[PDB]
Symmetry: C2
Subunit: 247 residues, 2 copies
Amino acid sequence: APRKFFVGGNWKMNGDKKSLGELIHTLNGAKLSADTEVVCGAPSIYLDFARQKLDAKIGVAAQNCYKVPKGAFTGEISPAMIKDIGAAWVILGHSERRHVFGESDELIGQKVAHALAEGLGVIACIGEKLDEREAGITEKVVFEQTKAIADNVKDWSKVVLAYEPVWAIGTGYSLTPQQAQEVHEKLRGWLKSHVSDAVAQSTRIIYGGSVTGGNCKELASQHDVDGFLVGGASLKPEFVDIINAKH
Amino acid sequence: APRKFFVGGNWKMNGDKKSLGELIHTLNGAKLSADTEVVCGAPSIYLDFARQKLDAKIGVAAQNCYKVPKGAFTGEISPAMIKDIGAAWVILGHSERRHVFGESDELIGQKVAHALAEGLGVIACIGEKLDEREAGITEKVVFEQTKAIADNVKDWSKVVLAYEPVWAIGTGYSLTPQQAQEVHEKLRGWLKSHVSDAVAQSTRIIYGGSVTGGNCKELASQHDVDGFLVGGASLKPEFVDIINAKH
């Protein structure tokens, strides 16, 4: 019935072996809540290293991948390769991929279908820009994004949706608890009526966008917030407090 | 005065630990020409592994990187990370980054300057699409692309130009030796007049695009072809015969 609290940490393009090694040693020794599912998204060049050093109770995610297993696609990695080093998750459609590197809704729908067909879990991110929110069209944009994903997903049991306002990323200005509830509620209600009631009840919709130890307890006690995608705070020991947001 | 013959192997999005390990062991025990500088571009996920297993005589290259050392750029790696695992090269501006993934000449230029600043060698790729060749503007396009690179190079000693006609990539169709010579001659001429004489004569300009064991001997014996960027043949043992193309 209940969805398991899910907290992913997106290290983005930070770290070396020495500094990620210290961060991992800290997580491996932290008191983590037993009912929380934790995943860390390491840069591709350190995925093998992260997976070796991290305790098996903690998931490892690639920060992107491509939509075929192999081929002439210089600079890309496939799910085949992610599985090969032993990782089980992939973050797809992150705001920075969509908006800095120009990945379309349809390309992400495609990447997700493949990731799933190869047996990866997927954290599919969606979110509106500031001009889109000031205009009132937040729902139209996130629905459009989710719809490109849904048309490609055969099975949702291994998918987590991450709602991440593009303008909340890296700014200290997060959504108020009430603003975030508003979008997940609507998003869950989209899944209900466009996929099924079961997929709505059982799919985790997590919030990202300036999540910190300061603001997470309030966010987590919202009915339709199922966890967090954490950026900058994932590189610091306050990441532990966020994993334990529910007490 | 002459330039070392140079052969880069671009594995692109291919391989796993087992099959790349076999390939690396083949190279490690191969008879290679001593006056050939070899470099292997591995997928980012296998860079660490590749650098550890490959003999130190053989260089290792990333297939791409971003333009700053760290930051909120999900899915990207920096030269600081490439250096951290001991690799010394990066491939930048590949046809596939340019045309599949939308990277502009200005972004590639910024990438080049940052990689050079952090102490990496660079294989910068330039080349025209088929519509551009039949329109008569091959030279316009490659000079435009070369200029975006040169405007961001302080020190040319660590740079290798790879000319790849995009219509030659994966079409089983290479330029004739005369056609390839014609472009490298033009390119070296361009460097002569827009940079310096010394740079023109010391800078390696390698040919990429449908290079096999069958055609490399004839290509390499042209006066301004200084080596190759090999695509699909870099995964076969005939990669060894291309490294040895000069006899």
